[PDB]
From a paper:
BeF3− is a close chemical mimetic of phosphate that has been employed in mechanistic studies of G-proteins and tubulin as a reversibly binding analog of the GTP γ-phosphate, whose interaction with FtsZ has not been documented. An intricate network of solvent molecules surrounds BeF3− and Mg2+ ions and contributes to stabilize the interactions between adjacent monomers. The last two solvent molecules belong to an H-bond connected path where three additional waters (B3 to B5) bridge bottom residue R143 with the GDP α-phosphate and the backbone of top residues M292 and F294. This solvent shell is altered in a structure lacking Mg2+, where bridging waters B2 to B4 shift away from R143 by approximately 1 Å and BeF3− tilts away from the precatalytic water by 6°, likely weakening BeF3− binding. Moreover, relocation of waters B2 to B4 upon Mg2+ binding enables bridging of R143 with the nucleotide phosphates, which arises as a key event to position its positive charge to assist catalysis.
FtsZ is an assembling GTPase that plays a key role during bacterial cell division. This widely conserved protein polymerizes in the presence of GTP and metal cations into polar filaments that gather at the center of dividing cells to form a dynamic Z-ring. First, GTP hydrolysis only occurs within the filament, as the complete catalytic site is formed at the interface between adjacent FtsZ monomers. We report a dozen filament structures of the FtsZ core (residues 12 to 316) from the pathogen S. aureus, hereafter SaFtsZ, in complex with various GTP mimetics and metal ions.
Author numbering: 9 to 315
C-alpha cells in the first residue's frame, strides 16, 4: 500500500503568495515549501519550510526583475532545495513569471525536483498586459524554461482575471480565483489518492497521464439536481483562466464521485462530455468513487494532458 508524498513549492513573490493563501485556506497531507530571494517577503511566509536563496548575490533583497539572478540564486542553493524536496513523490512548483526570482529560479527548482524522481507539475502565471512588453517577454522565456524542466505545465495568463472581475472586484479576490487552479488540482490528486474508489484510480495513473506530457489541465466540477453529471463535467473542463483548454487532449484521468444514486448512464454522459470537448482519440483512465455521505451532489475531477 502506497501513500504519495505531495509538496507545493512557491518560488518568488507570486508563488509564495499562492502558498500563503493556500495555507490560509486549509490543506493537509501536503508539505509547503517557500523559496525566495526576498527576505522581507519570506519572513512573512506561513510555510513550514522556508529557503532564502541567493543571499550572497542580492544581499537579502529580491532579484530586481533580473531572471539571471534568480537562476544563479537557485543554482547556488541547490543542496538546500534538494534537502527540502527529498522524499517527494509529486511536486507542484508555483510561480509568477516575469520577475527575477520566479522566472529564473522556478525552472531550476522544477529541474531539481524531476532529477530527484518526483512527478513535477508547474503552475505559473503570465504577467498582465498592463505590466508592459518587457515583462511579458521575460515571462515567455520563463515559461519556455519551465516547459523544459517539468513533467506538465499549467499556465494562467493574468489577463484572464480581467475577464472574471467587475470594475470593483478587489485585486486580492481576483488573485484567489487564480490560486484555485493550483489548490483544486492539488486537492483533486490528494483526494484521488486517499479514497478507495469502486473503480479505483491511484498515483500510478496520475504518473501515466502526467509524466513528460507538456501542457496540462486540472479541473474539478460539482453539481446537483437534473443534468448534474453533464454540468459537473462541463465545469471541470471549462475554466476561463487557462492558456491550455481541453481541446486536443491525448490523455485524460477522469474520476466521478457520487452517492449511491450515481447512475451508469450519467457516468457515460460525463465521460462523453470530456471525450467530445477534447475532439480527440484519447488514453482515458476512468474511475468512480461512491461516497454514501453524498446525497444529490456529483463531483467530476479531470486531468487532461497531451496536446
Ligand atoms: N495572479 C498573481 N500574479 C502575481 C502575484 N504576485 C505577482 N504576480 C505576477 O507575478 C509576476 C512576478 O512577480 P513576483 O513573483 O513578485 O516577482 P519575483 O518575486 O521577482 O519572482 C508579476 O509580474 C505579476 O504578473 C499574485 O499573488 N497573484
Ligand atoms: F522580485 Be523578483 F525577485 F524580481
Ligand atoms: K484511490
Amino acid at each position: 500500500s502506497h501513500m504519495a508524498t505531495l509538496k507545493v513549492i512557491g518560488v518568488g513573490g507570486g508563488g509564495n503568495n499562492a502558498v500563503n493563501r493556500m495555507i490560509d485556506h486549509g490543506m493537509n497531507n501536503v508539505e509547503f515549501i517557500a523559496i525566495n530571494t526576498d527576505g522581507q517577503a519570506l519572513n512573512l511566509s506561513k510555510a513550514e519550510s522556508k529557503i532564502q536563496i541567493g543571499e550572497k548575490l542580492t544581499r537579502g533583497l529580491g532579484a530586481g526583475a533580473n531572471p539571471e539572478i534568480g537562476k544563479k540564486a537557485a543554482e547556488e542553493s541547490r543542496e538546500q532545495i534538494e534537502d527540502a524536496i527529498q522524499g517527494a513523490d509529486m511536486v507542484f512548483v508555483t510561480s509568477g513569471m516575469g520577475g527575477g526570482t520566479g522566472t529564473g529560479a522556478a525552472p531550476v527548482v522544477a529541474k531539481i525536483a524531476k532529477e530527484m524522481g518526483a512527478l513535477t507539475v508547474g503552475v505559473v502565471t503570465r504577467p498582465f498586459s498592463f505590466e508592459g512588453r518587457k515583462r511579458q517577454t521575460q515571462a515567455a522565456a520563463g515559461v519556455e524554461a519551465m516547459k523544459a524542466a517539468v513533467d506538465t505545465l499549467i499556465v494562467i495568463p493574468n489577463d484572464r482575471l480581467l475577464d472574471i472581475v467587475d470594475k470593483s472586484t478587489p485585486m486580492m479576490e481576483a488573485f484567489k480565483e487564480a490560486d484555485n487552479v493550483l489548490r483544486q488540482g492539488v486537492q483533486g490528486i490528494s483526494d484521488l489518492i486517499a479514497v478507495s474508489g469502486e473503480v479505483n484510480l491511484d498515483f500510478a495513473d496520475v504518473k501515466t497521464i502526467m509524466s513528460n506530457q507538456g501542457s496540462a489541465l486540472m479541473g474539478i466540477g460539482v453539481s446537483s439536481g437534473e443534468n448534474r453529471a453533464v454540468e459537473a463535467a462541463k465545469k471541470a473542463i471549462s475554466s476561463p483562466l487557462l492558456e491550455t483548454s481541453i481541446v486536443g487532449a491525448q490523455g485524460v484521468l477522469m474520476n466521478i464521485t457520487g452517492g449511491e444514486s450515481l447512475s451508469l448512464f450519467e457516468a457515460q454522459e460525463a465521460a462523453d462530455i470530456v471525450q467530445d470537448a477534447a475532439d480527440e482519440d484519447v488514453n482515458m483512465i476512468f474511475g468512480t468513487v461512491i461516497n454514501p455521505e453524498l446525497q444529490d451532489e456529483i463531483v467530476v475531477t479531470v486531468i487532461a494532458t497531451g496536446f
